[PDB]
Design a protein around this ligand. Structure first.
Ligand SMILES: [Ca+2]
Lengths: 49, 49
């Protein structure tokens, strides 16, 4: 009578949500406060973070 | 006579002093020699007709 269609199934799901990286920024204001930059001046400025 | 005031950043300055009406004082003076006394007893400048 019944000629079974021999076909069973298995399934799965994958969730890719985020991007690998977050670039958190703290911008710099290099002449800063309690220091001074002059025209034609020479030197170095550094922000560690 | 001439005071130089600089910012907390500037540490080297090169000034050019120029006598512009020297052709005028020539009609009045016979010899005029200006000595520009520097910071702490140094003499760094000499101006003549
Ligand atoms: Ca400097």
């Amino acid at each position: 009578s019944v000629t079974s269609d021999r076909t069973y199934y298995g399934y799965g799901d994958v969730s890719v949500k985020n991007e690998p990286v977050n670039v958190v920024v703290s911008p710099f204001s290099f002449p800063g406060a309690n220091a001074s930059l002059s025209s034609g001046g020479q030197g170095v400025f550094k922000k560690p973070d | 006579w001439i005071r130089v005031v600089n910012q907390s950043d500037v540490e080297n300055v090169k000034l050019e002093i120029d006598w512009v009406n020297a052709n005028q004082a020539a009609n009045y003076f016979d010899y005029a020699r200006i000595l520009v006394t520097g910071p702490n007893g140094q003499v760094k400048g000499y101006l003549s007709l």
